[PDB]
mmCIF file of C-alpha atoms (C1' of nucleotides) in Angstrom:
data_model
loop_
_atom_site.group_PDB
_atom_site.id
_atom_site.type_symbol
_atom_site.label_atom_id
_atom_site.label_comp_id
_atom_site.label_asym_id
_atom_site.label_seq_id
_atom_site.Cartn_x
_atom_site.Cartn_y
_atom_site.Cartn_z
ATOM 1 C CA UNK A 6 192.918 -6.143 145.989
ATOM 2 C CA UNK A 7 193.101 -8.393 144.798
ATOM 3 C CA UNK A 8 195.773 -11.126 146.033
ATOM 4 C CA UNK A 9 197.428 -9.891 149.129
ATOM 5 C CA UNK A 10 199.713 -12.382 149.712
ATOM 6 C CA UNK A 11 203.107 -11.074 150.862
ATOM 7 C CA UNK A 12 206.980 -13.183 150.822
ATOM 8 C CA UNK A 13 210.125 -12.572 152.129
ATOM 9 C CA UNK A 14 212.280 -14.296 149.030
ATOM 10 C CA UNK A 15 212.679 -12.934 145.813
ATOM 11 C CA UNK A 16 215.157 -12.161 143.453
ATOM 12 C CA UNK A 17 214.359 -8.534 141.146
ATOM 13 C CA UNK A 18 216.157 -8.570 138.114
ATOM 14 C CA UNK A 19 217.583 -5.247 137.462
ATOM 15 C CA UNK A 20 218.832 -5.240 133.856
ATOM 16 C CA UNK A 21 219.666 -1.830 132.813
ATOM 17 C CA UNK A 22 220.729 -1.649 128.767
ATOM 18 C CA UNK A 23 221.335 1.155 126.324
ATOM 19 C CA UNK A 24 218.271 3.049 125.516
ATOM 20 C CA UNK A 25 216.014 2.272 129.011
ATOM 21 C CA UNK A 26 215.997 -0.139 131.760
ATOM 22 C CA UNK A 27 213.100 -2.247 133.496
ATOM 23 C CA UNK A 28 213.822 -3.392 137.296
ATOM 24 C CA UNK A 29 210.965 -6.600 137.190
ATOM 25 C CA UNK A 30 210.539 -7.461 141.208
ATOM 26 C CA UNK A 31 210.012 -10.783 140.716
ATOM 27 C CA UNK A 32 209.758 -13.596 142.984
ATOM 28 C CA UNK A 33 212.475 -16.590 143.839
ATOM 29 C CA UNK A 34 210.275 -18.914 141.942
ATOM 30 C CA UNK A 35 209.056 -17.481 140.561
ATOM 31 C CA UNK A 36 206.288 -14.062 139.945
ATOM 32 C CA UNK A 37 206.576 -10.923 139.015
ATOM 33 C CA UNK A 38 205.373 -8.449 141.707
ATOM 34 C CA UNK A 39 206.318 -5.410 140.402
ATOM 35 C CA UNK A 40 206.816 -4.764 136.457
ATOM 36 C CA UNK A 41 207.588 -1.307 136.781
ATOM 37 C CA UNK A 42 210.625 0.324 135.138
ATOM 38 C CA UNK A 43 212.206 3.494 133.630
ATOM 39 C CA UNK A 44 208.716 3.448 131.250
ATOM 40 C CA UNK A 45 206.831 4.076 134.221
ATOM 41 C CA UNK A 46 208.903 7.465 134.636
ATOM 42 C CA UNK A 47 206.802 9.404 132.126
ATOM 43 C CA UNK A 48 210.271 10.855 130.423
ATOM 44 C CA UNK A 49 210.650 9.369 127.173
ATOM 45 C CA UNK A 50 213.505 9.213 124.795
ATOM 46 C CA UNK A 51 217.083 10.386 125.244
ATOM 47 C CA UNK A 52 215.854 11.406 129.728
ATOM 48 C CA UNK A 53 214.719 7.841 129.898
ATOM 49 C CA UNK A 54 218.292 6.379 130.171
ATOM 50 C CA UNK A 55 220.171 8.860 132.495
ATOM 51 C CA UNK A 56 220.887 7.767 136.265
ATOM 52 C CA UNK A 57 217.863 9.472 137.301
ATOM 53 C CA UNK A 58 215.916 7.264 135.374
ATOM 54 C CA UNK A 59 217.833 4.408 137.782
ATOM 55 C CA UNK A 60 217.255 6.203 141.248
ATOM 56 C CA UNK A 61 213.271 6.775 139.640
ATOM 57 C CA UNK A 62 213.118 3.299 138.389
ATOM 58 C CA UNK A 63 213.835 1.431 141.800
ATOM 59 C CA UNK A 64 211.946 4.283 143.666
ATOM 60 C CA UNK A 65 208.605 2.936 141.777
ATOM 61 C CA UNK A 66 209.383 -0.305 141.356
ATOM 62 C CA UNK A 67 210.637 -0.479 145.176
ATOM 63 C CA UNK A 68 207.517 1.248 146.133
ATOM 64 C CA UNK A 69 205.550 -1.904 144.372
ATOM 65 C CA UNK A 70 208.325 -4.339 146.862
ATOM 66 C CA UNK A 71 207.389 -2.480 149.214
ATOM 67 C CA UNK A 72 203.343 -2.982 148.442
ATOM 68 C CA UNK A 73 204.124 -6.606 149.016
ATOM 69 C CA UNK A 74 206.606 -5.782 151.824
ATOM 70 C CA UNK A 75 209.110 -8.568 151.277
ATOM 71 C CA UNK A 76 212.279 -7.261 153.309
ATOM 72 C CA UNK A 77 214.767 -9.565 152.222
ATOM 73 C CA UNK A 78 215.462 -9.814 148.305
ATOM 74 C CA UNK A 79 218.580 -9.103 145.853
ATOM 75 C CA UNK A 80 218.914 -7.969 142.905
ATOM 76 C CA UNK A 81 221.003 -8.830 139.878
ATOM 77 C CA UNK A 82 222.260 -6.932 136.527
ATOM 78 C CA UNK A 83 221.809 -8.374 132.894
ATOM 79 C CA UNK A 84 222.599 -6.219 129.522
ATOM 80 C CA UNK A 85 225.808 -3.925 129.441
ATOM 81 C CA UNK A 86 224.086 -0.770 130.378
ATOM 82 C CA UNK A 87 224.538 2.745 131.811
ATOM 83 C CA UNK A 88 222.444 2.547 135.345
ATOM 84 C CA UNK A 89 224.008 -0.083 137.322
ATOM 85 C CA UNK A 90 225.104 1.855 140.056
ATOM 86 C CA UNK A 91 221.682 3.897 140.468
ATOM 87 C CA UNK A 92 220.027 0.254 140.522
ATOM 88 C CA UNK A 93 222.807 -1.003 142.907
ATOM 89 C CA UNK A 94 222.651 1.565 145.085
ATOM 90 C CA UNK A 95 218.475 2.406 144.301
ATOM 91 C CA UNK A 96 217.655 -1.303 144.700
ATOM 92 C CA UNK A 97 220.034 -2.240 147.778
ATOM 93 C CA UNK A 98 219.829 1.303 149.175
ATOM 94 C CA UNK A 99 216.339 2.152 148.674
ATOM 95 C CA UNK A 100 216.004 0.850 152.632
ATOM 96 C CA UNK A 101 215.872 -2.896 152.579
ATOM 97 C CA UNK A 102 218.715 -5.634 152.834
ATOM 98 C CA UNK A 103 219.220 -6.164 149.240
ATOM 99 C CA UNK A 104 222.537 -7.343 149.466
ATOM 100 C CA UNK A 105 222.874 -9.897 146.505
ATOM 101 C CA UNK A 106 224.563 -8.857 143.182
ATOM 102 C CA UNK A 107 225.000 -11.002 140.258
ATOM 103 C CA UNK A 108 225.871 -10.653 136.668
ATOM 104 C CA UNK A 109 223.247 -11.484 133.911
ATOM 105 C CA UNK A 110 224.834 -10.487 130.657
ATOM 106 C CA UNK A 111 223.529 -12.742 128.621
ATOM 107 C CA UNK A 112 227.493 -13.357 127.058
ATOM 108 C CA UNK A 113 227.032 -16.042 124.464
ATOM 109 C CA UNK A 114 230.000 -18.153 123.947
ATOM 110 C CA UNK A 115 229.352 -19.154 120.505
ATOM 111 C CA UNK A 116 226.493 -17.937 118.606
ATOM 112 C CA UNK A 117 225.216 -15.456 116.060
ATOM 113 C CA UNK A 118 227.170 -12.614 114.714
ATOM 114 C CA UNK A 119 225.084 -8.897 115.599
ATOM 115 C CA UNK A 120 224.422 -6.587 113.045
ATOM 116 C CA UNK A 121 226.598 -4.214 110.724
ATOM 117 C CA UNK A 122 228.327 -0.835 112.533
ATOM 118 C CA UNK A 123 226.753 1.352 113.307
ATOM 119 C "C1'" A B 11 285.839 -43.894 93.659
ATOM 120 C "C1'" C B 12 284.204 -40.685 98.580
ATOM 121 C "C1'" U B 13 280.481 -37.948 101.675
ATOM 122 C "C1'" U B 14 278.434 -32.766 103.836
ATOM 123 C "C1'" G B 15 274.221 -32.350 99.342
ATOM 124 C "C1'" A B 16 269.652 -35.105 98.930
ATOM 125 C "C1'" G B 17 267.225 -39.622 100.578
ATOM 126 C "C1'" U B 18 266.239 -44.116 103.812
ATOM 127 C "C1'" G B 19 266.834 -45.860 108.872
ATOM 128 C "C1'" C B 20 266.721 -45.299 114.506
ATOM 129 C "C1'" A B 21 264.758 -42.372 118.548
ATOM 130 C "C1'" G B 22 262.355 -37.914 120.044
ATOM 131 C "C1'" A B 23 259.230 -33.658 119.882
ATOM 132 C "C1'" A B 24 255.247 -30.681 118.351
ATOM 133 C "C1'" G B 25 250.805 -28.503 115.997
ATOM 134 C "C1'" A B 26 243.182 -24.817 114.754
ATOM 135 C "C1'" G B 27 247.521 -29.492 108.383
ATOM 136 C "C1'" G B 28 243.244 -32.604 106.002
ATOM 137 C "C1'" A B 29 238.822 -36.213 105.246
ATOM 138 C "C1'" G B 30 234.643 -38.923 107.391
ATOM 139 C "C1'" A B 31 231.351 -40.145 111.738
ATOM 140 C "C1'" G B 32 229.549 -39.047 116.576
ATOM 141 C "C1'" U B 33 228.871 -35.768 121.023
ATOM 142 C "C1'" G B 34 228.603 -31.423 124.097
ATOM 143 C "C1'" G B 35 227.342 -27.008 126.178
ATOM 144 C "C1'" A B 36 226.725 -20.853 126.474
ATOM 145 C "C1'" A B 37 223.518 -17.418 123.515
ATOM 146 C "C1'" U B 38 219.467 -15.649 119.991
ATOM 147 C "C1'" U B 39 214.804 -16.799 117.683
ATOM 148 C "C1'" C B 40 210.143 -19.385 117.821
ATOM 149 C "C1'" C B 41 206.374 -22.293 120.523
ATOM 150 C "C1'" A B 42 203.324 -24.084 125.149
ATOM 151 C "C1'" C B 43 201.865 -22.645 130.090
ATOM 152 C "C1'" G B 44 202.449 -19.927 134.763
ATOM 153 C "C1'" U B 45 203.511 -14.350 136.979
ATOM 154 C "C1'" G B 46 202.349 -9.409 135.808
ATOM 155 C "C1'" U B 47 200.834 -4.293 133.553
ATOM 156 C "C1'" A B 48 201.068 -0.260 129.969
ATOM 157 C "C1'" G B 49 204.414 0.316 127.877
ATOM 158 C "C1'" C B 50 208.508 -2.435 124.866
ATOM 159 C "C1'" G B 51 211.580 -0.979 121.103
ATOM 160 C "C1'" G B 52 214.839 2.149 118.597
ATOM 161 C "C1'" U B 53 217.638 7.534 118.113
ATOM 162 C "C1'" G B 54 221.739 12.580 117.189
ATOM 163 C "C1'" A B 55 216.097 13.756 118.125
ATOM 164 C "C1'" A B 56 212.079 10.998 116.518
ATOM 165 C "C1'" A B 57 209.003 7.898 113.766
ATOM 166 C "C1'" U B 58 207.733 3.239 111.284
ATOM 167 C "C1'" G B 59 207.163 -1.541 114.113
ATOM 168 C "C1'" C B 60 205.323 -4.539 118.612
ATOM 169 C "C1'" G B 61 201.900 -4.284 122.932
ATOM 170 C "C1'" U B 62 194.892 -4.654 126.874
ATOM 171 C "C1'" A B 63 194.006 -10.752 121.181
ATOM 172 C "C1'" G B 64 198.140 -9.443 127.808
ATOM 173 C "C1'" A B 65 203.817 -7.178 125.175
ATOM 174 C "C1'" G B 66 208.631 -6.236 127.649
ATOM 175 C "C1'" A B 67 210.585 -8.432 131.746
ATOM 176 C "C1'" U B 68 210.632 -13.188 134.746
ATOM 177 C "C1'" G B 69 209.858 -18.831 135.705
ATOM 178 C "C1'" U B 70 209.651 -23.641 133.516
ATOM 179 C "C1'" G B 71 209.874 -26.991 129.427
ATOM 180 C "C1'" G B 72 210.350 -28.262 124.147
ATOM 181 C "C1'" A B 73 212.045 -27.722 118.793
ATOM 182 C "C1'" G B 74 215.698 -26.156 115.241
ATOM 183 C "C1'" G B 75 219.804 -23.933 112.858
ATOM 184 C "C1'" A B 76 224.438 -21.649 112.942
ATOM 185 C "C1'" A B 77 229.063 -20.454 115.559
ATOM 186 C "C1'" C B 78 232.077 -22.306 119.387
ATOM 187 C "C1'" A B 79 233.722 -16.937 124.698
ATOM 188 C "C1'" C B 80 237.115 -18.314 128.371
ATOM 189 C "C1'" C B 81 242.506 -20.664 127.147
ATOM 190 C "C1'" A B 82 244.025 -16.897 122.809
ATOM 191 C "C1'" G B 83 249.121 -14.290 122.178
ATOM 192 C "C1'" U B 84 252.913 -9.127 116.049
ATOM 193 C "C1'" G B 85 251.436 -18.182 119.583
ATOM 194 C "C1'" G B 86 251.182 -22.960 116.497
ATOM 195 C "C1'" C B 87 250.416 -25.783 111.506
ATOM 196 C "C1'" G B 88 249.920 -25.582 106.048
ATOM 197 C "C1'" A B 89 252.303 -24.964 99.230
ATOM 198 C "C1'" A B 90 248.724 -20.879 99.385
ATOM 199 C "C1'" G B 91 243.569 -19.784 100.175
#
RNA sequence: ACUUGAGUGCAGAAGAGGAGAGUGGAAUUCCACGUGUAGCGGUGAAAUGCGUAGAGAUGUGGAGGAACACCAGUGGCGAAG
């Protein structure tokens, strides 16, 4: 209700930052089956970046990979952030064999210079 | 008059020394379309701002500018900047 279609692949990127962090389930195209992150825990502001909001994060957002079943998919972490190891552990360990792990910080080799400290 | 000073020669070495042309990627923005929903964002805590006109994220492609990570180090070069 209303596309059931269900997938093994799929690669969720789990890209925890500063303030928040959204886990998007998305496929190894590909889709995104599950855009449901730390917003989707209803704690907002300064409780919507602790490690809970990692082990909460993956418990929805798994929930929705679980919705479309898929057992086998990894995940991968982009942004230097303070959840990796509740989406690691969350993602991986939430009861499926999520056992890839890559690194997605977006590290520019040149590029432009971020703003004033601080 | 003579040769170490200083210069020429001969052979080596080295460098982000300069000027002009061309080329290459990583990253950000923006745009087009797929996928998808209700948040994204920021903070000391929030709000302004953005988002159901479909955002964030994710996939693909295109345009353009600026600076070149790793080597890279109280390393090198320059009269100094």
């Amino acid at each position: 209700r209303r596309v059931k279609k269900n997938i093994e692949s799929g690669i969720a990127h789990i890209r925890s930052t500063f303030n928040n962090t959204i886990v998007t389930i998305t496929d190894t195209h590909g889709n995104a089956i599950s855009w449901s992150s730390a917003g989707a825990l209803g704690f907002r502001g300064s409780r919507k970046s602790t490690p809970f909001a990692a082990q909460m994060a993956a418990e929805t957002a798994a929930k929705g990979s679980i919705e479309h079943g898929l057992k086998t998919l990894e995940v991968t972490v982009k942004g230097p952030g303070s959840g990796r190891e509740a989406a690691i552990r969350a993602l991986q360990a939430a009861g499926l064999e999520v056992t890839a792990i890559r690194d997605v910080t977006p590290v520019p080799h040149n590029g432009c210079r971020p703003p004033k400290r601080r």
